[PDB]
Design an enzyme around this catalytic site. Structure first.
Site, short mmCIF file in Angstrom:
data_model
loop_
_atom_site.label_atom_id
_atom_site.label_comp_id
_atom_site.label_asym_id
_atom_site.label_seq_id
_atom_site.Cartn_x
_atom_site.Cartn_y
_atom_site.Cartn_z
N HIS A 222 2.89 -2.79 15.96
CA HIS A 222 3.36 -1.69 15.11
C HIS A 222 3.17 -0.32 15.77
O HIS A 222 3.80 0.66 15.35
CB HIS A 222 2.71 -1.74 13.70
N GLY B 289 -5.14 5.69 13.48
CA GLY B 289 -5.09 5.88 14.91
C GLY B 289 -6.02 5.00 15.72
O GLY B 289 -6.12 5.18 16.94
N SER C 77 -5.92 1.45 15.37
CA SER C 77 -5.36 0.13 15.61
C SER C 77 -5.33 -0.10 17.12
O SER C 77 -5.15 0.83 17.91
CB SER C 77 -3.97 -0.01 14.98
C1 O31 Z 1 -2.01 0.83 3.86
C2 O31 Z 1 -2.30 0.72 5.37
C3 O31 Z 1 -3.84 0.85 5.55
C4 O31 Z 1 -1.56 1.84 6.16
C5 O31 Z 1 -1.84 -0.67 5.88
N1 O31 Z 1 -2.62 -1.70 5.27
C6 O31 Z 1 -1.90 -2.89 4.79
O1 O31 Z 1 -0.70 -2.98 4.90
O2 O31 Z 1 -2.70 -3.91 4.21
C7 O31 Z 1 -2.00 -5.06 3.82
C8 O31 Z 1 -2.66 -5.66 2.62
C9 O31 Z 1 -3.71 -6.61 3.13
C10 O31 Z 1 -3.33 -6.96 4.59
C11 O31 Z 1 -2.11 -6.07 4.94
O3 O31 Z 1 -0.96 -6.82 4.98
C12 O31 Z 1 0.08 -6.24 5.74
C13 O31 Z 1 -0.22 -6.34 7.27
C14 O31 Z 1 0.28 -5.36 8.02
C15 O31 Z 1 0.10 -5.31 9.54
F1 O31 Z 1 -0.88 -4.41 9.91
F2 O31 Z 1 -0.22 -6.51 10.09
C16 O31 Z 1 1.43 -4.83 10.11
N2 O31 Z 1 2.28 -5.64 10.95
C17 O31 Z 1 3.57 -5.04 11.49
C18 O31 Z 1 4.43 -5.82 12.33
C19 O31 Z 1 5.62 -5.26 12.81
C20 O31 Z 1 5.98 -3.93 12.49
C21 O31 Z 1 5.12 -3.15 11.67
C22 O31 Z 1 3.92 -3.72 11.18
N3 O31 Z 1 3.02 -2.88 10.29
C23 O31 Z 1 1.80 -3.43 9.78
O4 O31 Z 1 0.94 -2.67 8.94
C24 O31 Z 1 1.20 -1.27 8.99
C25 O31 Z 1 0.43 -0.70 10.16
C26 O31 Z 1 -0.99 -0.88 9.72
C27 O31 Z 1 -1.94 0.27 10.08
O5 O31 Z 1 -1.84 1.38 9.63
N4 O31 Z 1 -3.00 -0.05 11.02
C28 O31 Z 1 -4.07 0.87 11.41
C29 O31 Z 1 -3.83 2.07 12.30
O6 O31 Z 1 -4.67 2.82 12.68
N5 O31 Z 1 -2.45 2.16 12.65
S1 O31 Z 1 -2.17 3.48 13.61
O7 O31 Z 1 -3.02 3.49 14.81
O8 O31 Z 1 -2.39 4.68 12.80
C30 O31 Z 1 -0.41 3.48 13.96
C31 O31 Z 1 0.53 3.41 12.74
C32 O31 Z 1 -0.02 4.38 15.13
C33 O31 Z 1 0.08 2.84 15.27
C34 O31 Z 1 -5.46 0.22 11.51
C35 O31 Z 1 -5.08 1.06 10.27
C36 O31 Z 1 -5.83 2.39 10.05
F3 O31 Z 1 -5.03 3.29 9.40
F4 O31 Z 1 -6.81 2.09 9.15
N6 O31 Z 1 -0.93 -0.80 8.24
C37 O31 Z 1 0.51 -0.70 7.81
C38 O31 Z 1 -2.09 -0.79 7.37
O9 O31 Z 1 -3.19 -0.88 7.83
#
Ligand code: O31
Ligand code: ZN
Length: 202
Positions: free
Chosen positions: A78, A158, A160
């Site tokens: 993602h 940020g 992940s």
């Molecule tokens: C609400 C919430 C917390 C934003 C969201 N939670 C959430 O959805 O929980 C549900 C309910 C229980 C499990 C989960 O089931 C969904 C699984 C989602 C996934 F993760 F597997 C995912 N597979 C994808 C595959 C292809 C394309 C897009 C995808 N998008 C995904 O998820 C999206 C992304 C992930 C995210 O934000 N990750 C982090 C991060 O830092 N990103 S980042 O660096 O800023 C950035 C966006 C720059 C790259 C670590 C968390 C930090 F912020 F804490 N998400 C949303 C979340 O965590």
């Protein structure tokens, strides 16, 4: 679009810093500013020296982390999509891509250090964030852990692609998701190292 000659190309992921875990204090370091990051993303050519296990990485639109385990620099789909990573010789194509695991990987950059996959079977874990916060996490499932001290999601955004480590400093997983209630992160989900080891055929 229908006009191929003007269709654009997405830039490479770029290493812009690292989380320094070398000594007795964890701290983030920036190695490239926004202008150089933009230029490097377009060319794919990054001549900067790479060090350490956890990199801070950026695209044109996002910033997150990437972690070297067993010779592979791993991050989240993602964040990276299918993008190449910038390297001294030009853009490097992903060696692993698995949208179903939210996972991608490239060959680890020259100069990086790799974490060893954990075989301890220990459930006392440590999440490392892009701000070099070390966050205790109790393992709660194959891919789930609870924060000992819940925190606003802003503190985890940020991060992940960052590691969960065991007490011995082995890699247990790659942070990919937060579980929140009213904006407070109480739990996280991660790609377990065994799911990577399967992906790797180690
Ligand atoms: C609400 C919430 C917390 C934003 C969201 N939670 C959430 O959805 O929980 C549900 C309910 C229980 C499990 C989960 O089931 C969904 C699984 C989602 C996934 F993760 F597997 C995912 N597979 C994808 C595959 C292809 C394309 C897009 C995808 N998008 C995904 O998820 C999206 C992304 C992930 C995210 O934000 N990750 C982090 C991060 O830092 N990103 S980042 O660096 O800023 C950035 C966006 C720059 C790259 C670590 C968390 C930090 F912020 F804490 N998400 C949303 C979340 O965590
Ligand atoms: Zn271990």
């Amino acid at each position: 679009g229908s006009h191929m000659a003007s269709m654009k190309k997405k830039g490479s992921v770029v290493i812009v810093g690292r989380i320094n875990l070398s000594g007795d204090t964890a701290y983030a370091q920036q190695t490239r500013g926004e202008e150089g990051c933009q230029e490097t993303s377009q060319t794919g050519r990054d001549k900067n020296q790479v060090e350490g296990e956890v990199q801070i990485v950026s695209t044109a639109t996002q910033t997150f982390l990437a972690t070297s385990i067993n010779g592979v620099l791993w991050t989240v789909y993602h964040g990276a999509g299918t993008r190449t990573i910038a390297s001294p010789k030009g853009p490097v194509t992903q060696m692993y891509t698995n949208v179903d695991k939210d996972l991608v990987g490239w060959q680890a950059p020259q100069g990086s250090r790799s974490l060893t996959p954990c075989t301890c079977g220990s459930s006392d874990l440590y999440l490392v964030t892009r701000h070099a916060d070390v966050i205790p996490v109790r393992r709660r499932g194959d891919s789930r852990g609870s924060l000992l001290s819940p925190r606003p999601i802003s503190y985890l955004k940020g991060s992940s692609g960052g590691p969960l480590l065991c007490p011995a400093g082995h890699a247990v997983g790659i942070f990919r998701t937060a579980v929140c209630t009213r904006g407070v992160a109480k739990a996280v989900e991660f790609i377990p190292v065994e799911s990577l080891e399967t992906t790797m055929r180690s």
